[model samples]
Target: KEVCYGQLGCFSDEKPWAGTLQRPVKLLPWSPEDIDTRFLLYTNENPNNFQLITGTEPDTIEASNFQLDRKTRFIIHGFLDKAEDSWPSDMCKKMFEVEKVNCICVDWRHGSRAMYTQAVQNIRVVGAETAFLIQALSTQLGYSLEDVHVIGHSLGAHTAAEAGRRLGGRVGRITGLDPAGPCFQDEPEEVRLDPSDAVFVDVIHTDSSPIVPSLGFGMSQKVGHLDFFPNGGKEMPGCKEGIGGFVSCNHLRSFEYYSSSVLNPDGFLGYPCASYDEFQESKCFPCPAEGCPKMGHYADQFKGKTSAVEQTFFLNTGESGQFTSWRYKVSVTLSGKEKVNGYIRIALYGSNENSKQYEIFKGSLKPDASHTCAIDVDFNVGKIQKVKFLWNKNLSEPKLGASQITVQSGEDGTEYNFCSSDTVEENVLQSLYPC
Candidate 1:
């Protein structure tokens, strides 16, 4: 069996040798017999930008004498600033005979807003092109599209997502390794993950800080069947010491986390274990004794074990058929010398009257401010007989204000005033869902 490798470039400095890839292009000389698998490697040139495609070089490797045989194929793509590091020509020749595992390298140039836009667009184009390549390979190999697997890192995750969406039912699996890029934390359903499109989709989050709230925070988007938040979605301990300190301190060694099967099926790189349980018991451990300053932020990653709220919430759902939906909206207000984050939440209680309780949906507002947002509530029942709205001054912080309550029927649009937190419950019934 032959493997195929495709490498995409990141943002880099424009060099004379390699031309810019404004769109997707098929790399030459694909051979199937020499390689057993394929790799699509994408790079994140500058991690600090938080955007894609703003660098200046291309994808470069230092391997030598790489010749494709009947079995293997390697595809390389470059980004903005970085160029391919030329492999020694001698080693390139020896590549023909060696049956080493094939790999793909992609460069996702990290840069400013302009660069980011270019990179995102470029990646999407490449994703479409990759799909075509995979389809062709499937036809030649007499295998289904399910045989293809993709592993992406950082912004590369978005690239894979685009590809999966384009390929729809054809893609087998996509492994998102630390998907990072702009607007990923809060993007809507259309722009984010689509579970129906892929057979098996998994997301691995190394950093879950919702820096860009638009990207669908913490893997909540229904796209991934199983999302793994390693170390509870906080900054990896190895990455916390600053990039400079990290590289200087041998941070690269931390790659062992991936090699160790802390989240994968196989055991560690060199040391195999009896089962995943045994592997986790041996390698995965709590944060160092010092503890992380942002522990609360990362807690949600480990819903069952680390997150108290998630545990309680999931427990409550299990106990009762009652489903709960929380909606929050807030507007800022200025009074004197203070600034605040105001919000609102609407909690719809289940059919069981015994379990009735107000879930807060409220935020702070000073003398003059306006903000509005809605929450989608999909009740298991065909009709919503009643709904209860809970008001909180600052729901994010429970102790900040008193809870106010209101009820409405299907007839009403459920309109309410933010200033007074007043609800015309009686009028609502007459206006919206009337007898």
Candidate 2:
């Protein structure tokens, strides 16, 4: 915790001014020193962890394999995050695993402290400095801005937009993963990431919820050429459902899914998903258009797409399966207690006669009190497979006792039967481990 402007004390993670944080907001122009940026550059010359021009060189920057011809990806973070040898580390590694390109992770850790207002404001400077760095590469190293992809999450999303804006909106592409909404949701197009922010602005709305400064950190408005809202862009799968630990899993899901999209390129696929249309017209279901554009890293298929060609795509995903999967609904009956929190591995065998396995429960589960558990599934549960049920928890492994598990379809649900054991006995230990 620290004091600022000789008056206000602030937590590194807390937003100083919020809500209608009233004030004449000015565009923050960053000097070289205030930028406090770091670069993790990977060239074929330094194929491993080698880097160059951490940017202290200011005007005359050089690197081992800083290529002007290869694609360069700049990953920016949001809300209290920096490159600090932490992030962009994993993301860069994944990108390196796939292709030979210039991957730079920007670090403004000192400026990325707690306050939302300051962080939001500081992005302006970071974006300016980032734009300058790109220009530096262009003039000194023959770098072409057209080969750049700026990927940002939350505040980083806006940061990416800001950089594009300062560059006169000529950057190749900008991928916004749930751009922050608190201070800039209702702002003008120039204030946030919009279609004009770059040549092709593709967004992945992972947390476009209803609230702000809380569970509503994501902007629901489509601010890109191709907006992809996987799982309706709400509280994602495998996160706590209730109040206790209901923190930003919904917000963090944007980058988590994007990070995986790198290593598992083809794994992340989307169909034309929607909510209002799904209820009113049964539109875009059955997923039309055979080929699916990749989610992250390889999202070039969406390049050059403009608002005239805007599209919103949807896809399903599992807990940890490369951020992509199939979707299903399963009904289960617990043999013990009113509720239980554990892991469930279900194998559904349908008409195909081959059972596909999936991780049913990602984390916590609770109920007012009931014997039935409604499970939402997304993975390879095709034609059908026997959903093997296994329950395990971090604590005493919530007593499943003798819980005999089975799957019963509802409405136009699947055709299946119950193959179980017996009812869980009270106060008895339950140990289940099946794959």
TM-scores for every predicted model:
0.37, 0.68
Model 2: ten consecutive residues of lowest lDDT? 2-11
Candidate 1 lDDT by residue in tens digits, 1-435: 212333322323222101223212222212211211123322222211211111111112212121122222222222232213321111112232332322343333332112343454455445554555455455543436564555454445655666677777467666554454243544543334444445655555444444434322233332454454433333333432232221221222122333223222111111112222432333322222332111111221222232211111000011112122212121211221222444333434334431233222244533233333322232222233333333223123322121222332211223322223223221121111212
Model 2 C-alpha lDDT per residue in residues 58-82, reported as the tens digit of each score: 4435535676668888889877776
The list of candidate 1 runs beyond 4 A from truth reads 1-102, 106-114, 212-223, 241-256, 260-435
150, model 2: CA deviation in Å? 0.8
Q: What does each candidate score in C-alpha RMSD? A: 20.5, 10.3
Candidate 1 weakest lDDT stretch, 10 residues: 311-320
